[PDB]
Protein backbone atom coordinates (compact mmCIF):
# COMPACT_ATOMS: atom_id res chain seq x y z
CA UNK A 1 0.00 0.00 0.00
CA UNK A 2 2.47 1.68 -1.08
CA UNK A 3 0.41 0.99 -4.02
CA UNK A 4 2.19 1.50 -7.60
CA UNK A 5 0.70 1.75 -11.23
CA UNK A 6 2.68 1.70 -14.48
CA UNK A 7 2.56 3.27 -16.76
CA UNK A 8 1.59 6.85 -15.56
CA UNK A 9 1.53 8.07 -19.06
CA UNK A 10 0.41 6.36 -22.46
CA UNK A 11 -0.57 7.41 -25.66
CA UNK A 12 -1.50 3.97 -27.95
CA UNK A 13 -3.08 3.15 -31.21
CA UNK A 14 -6.51 1.66 -31.56
CA UNK A 15 -6.46 -2.08 -32.10
CA UNK A 16 -3.76 -3.49 -29.80
CA UNK A 17 -3.49 -4.93 -26.78
CA UNK A 18 -2.33 -2.80 -23.82
CA UNK A 19 -1.32 -3.74 -20.07
CA UNK A 20 -1.84 -1.71 -17.31
CA UNK A 21 -0.23 -3.01 -13.81
CA UNK A 22 -0.88 -2.58 -10.02
CA UNK A 23 1.43 -3.47 -7.54
CA UNK A 24 1.22 -3.22 -3.41
CA UNK A 25 3.24 -3.94 -0.25
CA UNK A 26 0.83 -4.47 1.94
CA UNK A 27 -0.96 -7.05 1.11
CA UNK A 28 -4.42 -6.88 1.17
CA UNK A 29 -6.43 -9.51 -0.46
CA UNK A 30 -8.57 -6.85 -2.43
CA UNK A 31 -7.82 -5.33 -5.43
CA UNK A 32 -9.87 -2.90 -7.71
CA UNK A 33 -9.67 -1.69 -11.40
CA UNK A 34 -11.48 1.61 -11.81
CA UNK A 35 -11.34 4.28 -14.42
CA UNK A 36 -12.16 7.95 -14.00
CA UNK A 37 -14.28 10.17 -17.05
CA UNK A 38 -15.17 13.44 -17.02
CA UNK A 39 -19.25 13.37 -15.55
CA UNK A 40 -19.36 10.00 -14.69
CA UNK A 41 -16.95 10.21 -11.44
CA UNK A 42 -14.60 6.52 -11.41
CA UNK A 43 -16.33 3.58 -12.26
CA UNK A 44 -14.95 -0.11 -11.69
CA UNK A 45 -14.05 -2.33 -14.12
CA UNK A 46 -13.11 -5.62 -12.32
CA UNK A 47 -11.98 -6.14 -8.79
CA UNK A 48 -10.36 -9.41 -6.77
CA UNK A 49 -10.22 -10.65 -3.25
CA UNK A 50 -7.31 -13.51 -3.57
CA UNK A 51 -4.95 -15.06 -6.46
CA UNK A 52 -7.31 -16.55 -9.25
CA UNK A 53 -10.90 -14.71 -7.62
CA UNK A 54 -11.69 -12.11 -10.41
CA UNK A 55 -15.41 -10.36 -10.09
CA UNK A 56 -16.85 -7.56 -13.19
CA UNK A 57 -17.86 -4.43 -11.84
CA UNK A 58 -20.24 -2.42 -13.92
CA UNK A 59 -18.08 -1.75 -17.03
CA UNK A 60 -16.20 -5.09 -17.76
CA UNK A 61 -16.52 -5.01 -21.24
CA UNK A 62 -13.53 -4.57 -23.63
CA UNK A 63 -10.78 -4.95 -20.41
CA UNK A 64 -9.46 -8.66 -18.98
CA UNK A 65 -7.36 -8.75 -15.96
CA UNK A 66 -5.43 -10.87 -13.52
CA UNK A 67 -4.72 -11.51 -10.22
CA UNK A 68 -0.94 -13.11 -10.38
CA UNK A 69 -0.28 -12.76 -7.13
CA UNK A 70 -1.14 -10.90 -3.54
CA UNK A 71 0.69 -8.23 -4.61
CA UNK A 72 -0.04 -8.06 -8.10
CA UNK A 73 -3.30 -7.11 -10.03
CA UNK A 74 -2.97 -6.42 -14.40
CA UNK A 75 -5.85 -4.30 -16.26
CA UNK A 76 -5.64 -5.35 -19.86
CA UNK A 77 -7.52 -3.55 -22.67
CA UNK A 78 -7.67 -6.31 -24.86
CA UNK A 79 -8.38 -4.59 -28.19
CA UNK A 80 -8.15 -0.68 -27.85
CA UNK A 81 -10.92 1.68 -28.65
CA UNK A 82 -11.30 4.99 -28.58
CA UNK A 83 -13.54 6.01 -25.67
CA UNK A 84 -11.18 3.72 -23.49
CA UNK A 85 -9.19 7.26 -23.31
CA UNK A 86 -9.73 7.81 -19.48
CA UNK A 87 -7.61 7.98 -16.33
CA UNK A 88 -7.45 4.34 -14.36
CA UNK A 89 -7.15 3.90 -10.63
CA UNK A 90 -6.06 1.02 -8.92
CA UNK A 91 -6.81 0.35 -5.72
CA UNK A 92 -6.41 -1.61 -2.53
CA UNK A 93 -8.93 -2.10 0.60
CA UNK A 94 -8.85 -3.13 3.84
CA UNK A 95 -11.36 -5.29 5.68
CA UNK A 96 -12.93 -2.25 6.75
CA UNK A 97 -12.81 0.21 3.41
CA UNK A 98 -9.97 1.16 3.72
CA UNK A 99 -8.98 2.28 0.52
CA UNK A 100 -5.10 2.93 -0.62
CA UNK A 101 -5.47 4.52 -4.58
CA UNK A 102 -2.20 4.31 -7.06
CA UNK A 103 -1.55 7.55 -8.53
CA UNK A 104 -3.42 6.83 -11.79
CA UNK A 105 -2.16 5.78 -15.39
CA UNK A 106 -3.78 8.49 -18.21
CA UNK A 107 -4.13 6.40 -21.32
CA UNK A 108 -5.16 7.98 -24.24
CA UNK A 109 -6.22 6.01 -27.23
CA UNK A 110 -6.06 6.94 -31.04
CA UNK A 111 -7.01 5.77 -34.38
CA UNK A 112 -3.98 6.68 -36.39
CA UNK A 113 -0.61 7.74 -34.50
CA UNK A 114 0.25 10.10 -37.93
CA UNK A 115 -1.97 12.66 -36.46
CA UNK A 116 0.30 13.05 -33.02
CA UNK A 117 1.63 16.37 -33.42
CA UNK A 118 3.60 18.55 -30.34
CA UNK A 119 2.27 22.29 -29.60
CA UNK A 120 3.95 24.82 -30.47
CA UNK A 121 4.47 27.51 -27.68
CA UNK A 122 4.50 30.88 -27.74
CA UNK A 123 4.69 33.87 -25.04
CA UNK A 124 2.97 37.25 -25.41
CA UNK A 125 4.13 40.54 -23.43
CA UNK A 126 1.70 42.37 -21.28
CA UNK A 127 0.13 45.30 -22.70
CA UNK A 128 1.01 48.84 -22.07
CA UNK A 129 -2.02 49.86 -21.03
CA UNK A 130 -2.76 47.29 -18.15
CA UNK A 131 0.40 48.37 -16.81
CA UNK A 132 -0.31 51.92 -17.02
CA UNK A 133 -3.90 51.16 -16.06
CA UNK A 134 -3.61 48.71 -13.20
CA UNK A 135 0.49 48.51 -12.04
CA UNK A 136 0.19 44.83 -12.95
CA UNK A 137 1.05 43.04 -16.43
CA UNK A 138 -0.37 39.50 -17.32
CA UNK A 139 1.91 37.67 -19.10
CA UNK A 140 -0.55 35.05 -21.59
CA UNK A 141 1.02 31.47 -22.57
CA UNK A 142 -0.34 29.84 -25.64
CA UNK A 143 0.21 26.27 -26.87
CA UNK A 144 -1.20 25.28 -30.31
CA UNK A 145 -1.45 22.48 -32.55
CA UNK A 146 -1.19 19.89 -30.45
CA UNK A 147 -2.56 15.99 -30.69
CA UNK A 148 -3.53 14.12 -29.13
CA UNK A 149 -4.71 16.22 -25.98
CA UNK A 150 -2.43 14.77 -23.53
CA UNK A 151 -0.31 17.76 -21.70
CA UNK A 152 1.63 20.00 -18.59
CA UNK A 153 2.00 23.74 -19.30
CA UNK A 154 3.73 25.11 -16.12
CA UNK A 155 5.56 28.50 -15.52
CA UNK A 156 9.10 29.24 -14.42
CA UNK A 157 10.54 32.74 -13.47
CA UNK A 158 14.46 33.31 -12.80
CA UNK A 159 15.07 29.04 -13.02
CA UNK A 160 12.18 28.12 -10.74
CA UNK A 161 8.75 26.89 -11.13
CA UNK A 162 5.44 29.07 -9.94
CA UNK A 163 2.39 28.69 -8.82
CA UNK A 164 1.01 31.85 -7.38
CA UNK A 165 -0.57 34.39 -10.06
CA UNK A 166 -1.32 31.61 -12.19
CA UNK A 167 -4.40 30.51 -13.90
CA UNK A 168 -4.37 27.65 -16.69
CA UNK A 169 -8.03 26.67 -18.92
CA UNK A 170 -8.88 23.40 -17.21
CA UNK A 171 -9.23 21.79 -20.87
CA UNK A 172 -7.62 22.58 -24.52
CA UNK A 173 -9.67 23.55 -26.86
CA UNK A 174 -10.61 22.34 -30.26
CA UNK A 175 -9.24 24.34 -33.62
CA UNK A 176 -11.17 22.21 -35.81
CA UNK A 177 -14.22 21.13 -33.59
CA UNK A 178 -16.20 19.29 -36.35
CA UNK A 179 -13.34 16.85 -36.76
CA UNK A 180 -12.64 13.67 -34.65
CA UNK A 181 -8.87 14.19 -34.88
CA UNK A 182 -8.86 18.10 -34.08
CA UNK A 183 -6.10 18.91 -33.06
CA UNK A 184 -6.01 20.80 -29.48
CA UNK A 185 -4.66 24.42 -27.85
CA UNK A 186 -4.92 25.85 -24.93
CA UNK A 187 -3.89 29.49 -22.67
CA UNK A 188 -2.14 30.11 -19.73
CA UNK A 189 -2.16 33.17 -17.60
CA UNK A 190 0.67 34.43 -15.44
CA UNK A 191 0.42 38.07 -13.67
CA UNK A 192 3.01 39.67 -12.33
CA UNK A 193 3.33 43.52 -10.92
CA UNK A 194 4.36 45.69 -13.45
CA UNK A 195 8.01 46.67 -11.12
CA UNK A 196 8.62 42.97 -11.66
CA UNK A 197 7.65 43.27 -15.03
CA UNK A 198 9.80 46.02 -16.02
CA UNK A 199 13.03 44.38 -14.54
CA UNK A 200 15.07 43.77 -17.01
CA UNK A 201 17.13 41.01 -15.33
CA UNK A 202 13.65 38.86 -14.64
CA UNK A 203 13.16 36.00 -16.86
CA UNK A 204 9.67 34.62 -18.16
CA UNK A 205 9.33 30.80 -19.44
CA UNK A 206 6.00 29.11 -20.25
CA UNK A 207 6.78 24.98 -20.31
CA UNK A 208 4.03 22.87 -21.92
CA UNK A 209 5.30 19.04 -21.45
CA UNK A 210 3.85 17.00 -24.39
CA UNK A 211 3.23 13.06 -24.17
CA UNK A 212 3.31 11.58 -27.28
CA UNK A 213 5.58 9.01 -29.34
CA UNK A 214 8.30 6.93 -27.45
CA UNK A 215 11.24 5.74 -29.39
CA UNK A 216 9.79 2.11 -30.20
CA UNK A 217 7.05 3.89 -32.57
CA UNK A 218 7.50 3.41 -35.99
CA UNK A 219 7.42 7.68 -37.95
CA UNK A 220 6.97 7.48 -41.99
CA UNK A 221 6.56 11.31 -42.40
CA UNK A 222 9.61 14.07 -43.09
CA UNK A 223 8.04 16.06 -40.21
CA UNK A 224 9.67 15.85 -37.06
CA UNK A 225 8.84 12.27 -35.12
CA UNK A 226 6.38 13.86 -32.73
CA UNK A 227 8.03 12.44 -29.18
CA UNK A 228 7.03 13.00 -26.01
CA UNK A 229 8.95 15.94 -25.13
CA UNK A 230 9.35 19.54 -23.32
CA UNK A 231 8.35 22.65 -25.57
CA UNK A 232 9.02 26.11 -23.97
CA UNK A 233 8.56 29.78 -25.13
CA UNK A 234 9.98 32.80 -23.24
CA UNK A 235 10.34 36.79 -22.80
CA UNK A 236 12.53 38.66 -20.38
CA UNK A 237 11.49 41.64 -18.44
CA UNK A 238 11.05 45.01 -20.53
CA UNK A 239 12.03 48.82 -18.92
CA UNK A 240 10.26 50.06 -22.15
CA UNK B 1 -29.72 -1.91 -6.25
CA UNK B 2 -27.74 0.47 -4.25
CA UNK B 3 -26.49 3.54 -5.65
CA UNK B 4 -25.40 7.45 -4.76
CA UNK B 5 -26.50 10.82 -6.31
CA UNK B 6 -24.84 13.89 -6.41
CA UNK B 7 -27.15 16.91 -7.52
CA UNK B 8 -25.15 19.17 -9.91
CA UNK B 9 -21.91 18.36 -12.20
CA UNK B 10 -20.92 22.01 -11.42
CA UNK B 11 -21.59 24.28 -8.79
CA UNK B 12 -20.54 27.94 -7.59
CA UNK B 13 -20.42 29.45 -4.36
CA UNK B 14 -19.57 32.88 -3.44
CA UNK B 15 -16.33 33.13 -1.19
CA UNK B 16 -16.90 33.49 1.92
CA UNK B 17 -20.24 31.66 2.09
CA UNK B 18 -21.56 28.21 3.21
CA UNK B 19 -20.46 25.04 1.26
CA UNK B 20 -22.84 23.00 0.75
CA UNK B 21 -22.31 19.85 -1.43
CA UNK B 22 -25.25 17.59 -1.66
CA UNK B 23 -24.97 13.41 -1.49
CA UNK B 24 -28.10 10.95 -0.90
CA UNK B 25 -28.02 7.27 -1.35
CA UNK B 26 -30.35 4.43 -2.59
CA UNK B 27 -29.45 1.54 -0.42
CA UNK B 28 -32.31 0.50 1.95
CA UNK B 29 -29.92 -0.19 5.13
CA UNK B 30 -27.56 2.18 6.10
CA UNK B 31 -24.00 2.17 4.19
CA UNK B 32 -20.90 3.42 4.93
CA UNK B 33 -20.69 6.99 2.92
CA UNK B 34 -17.82 8.43 1.84
CA UNK B 35 -16.75 11.86 0.78
CA UNK B 36 -13.30 12.47 -1.47
CA UNK B 37 -11.72 15.43 -2.89
CA UNK B 38 -9.55 15.61 -6.02
CA UNK B 39 -7.58 18.86 -6.42
CA UNK B 40 -6.54 19.95 -9.68
CA UNK B 41 -4.05 17.25 -11.09
CA UNK B 42 -4.41 15.19 -8.70
CA UNK B 43 -5.45 11.78 -7.22
CA UNK B 44 -8.66 11.31 -4.80
CA UNK B 45 -8.06 12.72 -1.25
CA UNK B 46 -10.63 11.05 1.63
CA UNK B 47 -12.00 14.06 3.49
CA UNK B 48 -14.54 12.02 5.99
CA UNK B 49 -16.31 8.78 6.22
CA UNK B 50 -19.48 7.94 8.24
CA UNK B 51 -18.68 4.21 10.02
CA UNK B 52 -21.92 3.82 11.50
CA UNK B 53 -20.28 5.15 14.82
CA UNK B 54 -21.25 9.41 15.03
CA UNK B 55 -24.09 10.63 13.05
CA UNK B 56 -22.08 13.93 12.66
CA UNK B 57 -18.68 13.48 11.17
CA UNK B 58 -15.91 15.99 10.81
CA UNK B 59 -12.79 16.03 8.78
CA UNK B 60 -9.68 18.28 8.11
CA UNK B 61 -10.19 22.44 7.77
CA UNK B 62 -13.56 22.45 8.70
CA UNK B 63 -15.40 20.11 6.42
CA UNK B 64 -18.29 17.90 8.25
CA UNK B 65 -21.32 15.79 7.35
CA UNK B 66 -24.54 14.49 8.86
CA UNK B 67 -25.86 11.05 8.51
CA UNK B 68 -29.88 11.78 7.94
CA UNK B 69 -31.48 8.29 7.97
CA UNK B 70 -34.86 9.68 7.21
CA UNK B 71 -33.85 11.68 3.96
CA UNK B 72 -31.55 9.27 2.62
CA UNK B 73 -28.55 11.91 3.10
CA UNK B 74 -25.35 12.51 3.58
CA UNK B 75 -24.40 16.50 2.67
CA UNK B 76 -20.75 17.58 2.90
CA UNK B 77 -20.65 21.33 4.17
CA UNK B 78 -17.77 23.65 5.25
CA UNK B 79 -18.45 26.98 7.36
CA UNK B 80 -16.71 29.73 4.41
CA UNK B 81 -15.63 28.66 0.78
CA UNK B 82 -12.08 29.51 0.06
CA UNK B 83 -10.75 29.98 -3.30
CA UNK B 84 -8.74 27.14 -2.27
CA UNK B 85 -11.19 24.72 -1.75
CA UNK B 86 -11.72 24.37 -5.88
CA UNK B 87 -11.62 21.11 -6.81
CA UNK B 88 -14.03 17.87 -7.65
CA UNK B 89 -15.80 16.57 -4.76
CA UNK B 90 -17.15 12.69 -4.78
CA UNK B 91 -19.43 10.94 -2.52
CA UNK B 92 -19.46 7.17 -2.43
CA UNK B 93 -20.90 4.32 -0.54
CA UNK B 94 -20.22 0.73 0.39
CA UNK B 95 -22.19 -1.75 -1.93
CA UNK B 96 -22.26 -5.53 -1.67
CA UNK B 97 -20.14 -5.76 1.71
CA UNK B 98 -17.45 -6.02 -1.14
CA UNK B 99 -16.32 -2.57 -2.51
CA UNK B 100 -17.03 1.59 -2.74
CA UNK B 101 -19.02 2.89 -5.14
CA UNK B 102 -18.60 6.46 -6.79
CA UNK B 103 -20.85 9.50 -7.20
CA UNK B 104 -20.37 11.12 -10.31
CA UNK B 105 -18.85 14.27 -8.88
CA UNK B 106 -19.36 17.77 -8.59
CA UNK B 107 -16.75 20.19 -9.18
CA UNK B 108 -16.93 23.47 -6.87
CA UNK B 109 -16.23 26.92 -8.12
CA UNK B 110 -15.84 29.67 -6.04
CA UNK B 111 -17.11 33.15 -7.03
CA UNK B 112 -13.93 35.55 -5.93
CA UNK B 113 -15.01 38.44 -4.09
CA UNK B 114 -14.18 41.19 -6.81
CA UNK B 115 -14.99 44.72 -4.62
CA UNK B 116 -13.44 47.63 -7.37
CA UNK B 117 -13.84 45.89 -10.75
CA UNK B 118 -11.95 47.19 -13.30
CA UNK B 119 -12.92 45.51 -16.58
CA UNK B 120 -10.85 45.39 -19.64
CA UNK B 121 -9.73 44.34 -22.92
CA UNK B 122 -6.15 44.60 -23.46
CA UNK B 123 -3.99 43.63 -26.81
CA UNK B 124 -1.02 41.56 -25.80
CA UNK B 125 2.35 41.10 -28.92
CA UNK B 126 4.14 37.53 -29.16
CA UNK B 127 7.88 38.25 -27.69
CA UNK B 128 9.13 37.11 -30.64
CA UNK B 129 9.09 38.79 -34.06
CA UNK B 130 4.99 38.77 -34.98
CA UNK B 131 2.06 40.07 -36.69
CA UNK B 132 0.48 37.96 -33.88
CA UNK B 133 -1.48 38.86 -30.93
CA UNK B 134 -3.62 37.90 -28.13
CA UNK B 135 -7.02 39.78 -26.41
CA UNK B 136 -6.94 40.05 -22.93
CA UNK B 137 -10.69 40.43 -21.24
CA UNK B 138 -9.54 40.76 -17.12
CA UNK B 139 -10.50 42.19 -13.69
CA UNK B 140 -14.55 41.56 -14.47
CA UNK B 141 -16.52 40.56 -10.91
CA UNK B 142 -18.71 37.22 -11.11
CA UNK B 143 -21.44 38.76 -12.44
CA UNK B 144 -19.72 38.48 -16.12
CA UNK B 145 -19.70 35.63 -18.22
CA UNK B 146 -17.90 34.71 -21.22
CA UNK B 147 -19.44 33.51 -24.57
CA UNK B 148 -18.14 30.94 -26.81
CA UNK B 149 -17.28 33.19 -30.08
CA UNK B 150 -19.82 32.94 -32.96
CA UNK B 151 -16.95 32.87 -35.57
CA UNK B 152 -15.27 29.71 -36.84
CA UNK B 153 -11.31 31.32 -36.71
CA UNK B 154 -11.78 33.61 -33.40
CA UNK B 155 -10.79 31.34 -30.17
CA UNK B 156 -12.10 32.55 -26.88
CA UNK B 157 -11.47 30.70 -23.53
CA UNK B 158 -13.39 30.29 -20.56
CA UNK B 159 -13.16 32.69 -17.44
CA UNK B 160 -10.19 31.47 -15.39
CA UNK B 161 -9.31 32.93 -11.86
CA UNK B 162 -6.01 33.53 -10.51
CA UNK B 163 -4.72 34.64 -7.58
CA UNK B 164 -1.41 36.92 -6.75
CA UNK B 165 -0.22 35.76 -3.54
CA UNK B 166 1.98 38.43 -3.62
CA UNK B 167 -0.45 41.19 -3.37
CA UNK B 168 -3.14 39.26 -2.43
CA UNK B 169 -4.93 39.72 -5.22
CA UNK B 170 -7.74 37.70 -7.62
CA UNK B 171 -8.62 38.47 -10.82
CA UNK B 172 -10.89 37.01 -13.74
CA UNK B 173 -9.39 36.87 -17.51
CA UNK B 174 -10.04 35.05 -20.71
CA UNK B 175 -8.11 34.74 -23.08
CA UNK B 176 -9.46 35.35 -27.29
CA UNK B 177 -6.80 34.93 -30.58
CA UNK B 178 -7.42 34.67 -34.14
CA UNK B 179 -5.03 34.68 -37.26
CA UNK B 180 -7.50 36.60 -39.29
CA UNK B 181 -6.32 40.17 -41.13
CA UNK B 182 -9.54 42.02 -39.59
CA UNK B 183 -9.43 40.78 -35.97
CA UNK B 184 -9.32 43.52 -33.70
CA UNK B 185 -9.21 43.43 -29.85
CA UNK B 186 -12.42 46.02 -29.61
CA UNK B 187 -14.79 43.19 -31.48
CA UNK B 188 -13.12 40.07 -29.88
CA UNK B 189 -16.01 39.94 -26.93
CA UNK B 190 -18.71 41.14 -29.49
CA UNK B 191 -20.68 37.85 -28.41
CA UNK B 192 -20.14 37.90 -24.88
CA UNK B 193 -22.37 40.01 -22.08
CA UNK B 194 -19.64 42.60 -21.10
CA UNK B 195 -19.90 45.85 -18.13
CA UNK B 196 -20.63 48.78 -19.77
CA UNK B 197 -17.93 50.34 -18.18
CA UNK B 198 -15.23 48.03 -19.98
CA UNK B 199 -11.98 49.62 -20.51
CA UNK B 200 -10.89 49.99 -24.13
CA UNK B 201 -7.51 51.86 -24.52
CA UNK B 202 -6.28 53.37 -28.13
Known amino acids: ADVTQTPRNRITKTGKRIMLECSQT?????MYWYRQDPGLGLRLIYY???????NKGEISDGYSVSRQAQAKFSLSLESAIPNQTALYFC??????????FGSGTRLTVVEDLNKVSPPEVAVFEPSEAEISHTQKATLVCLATGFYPDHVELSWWVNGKEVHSGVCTDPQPLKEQPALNDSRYSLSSRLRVSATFWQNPRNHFRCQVQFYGLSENDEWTQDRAKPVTQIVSAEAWGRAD | AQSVTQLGSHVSVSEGALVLLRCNYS??????LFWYVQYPNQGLQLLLK??????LVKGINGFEAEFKKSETSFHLTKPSAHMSDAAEYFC??????????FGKGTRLHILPNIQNPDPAVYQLRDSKSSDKSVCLFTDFDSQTNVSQSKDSDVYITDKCVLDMRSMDFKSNSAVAWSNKSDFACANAFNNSIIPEDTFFPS
Open chain 1, 91 to 100: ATSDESYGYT
Open chain 1, 26 to 30: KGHDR
Open chain 1, 48 to 54: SFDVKDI
Open chain 2, 27 to 32: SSVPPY
Open chain 2, 50 to 55: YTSAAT
Open chain 2, 92 to 101: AVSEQDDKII
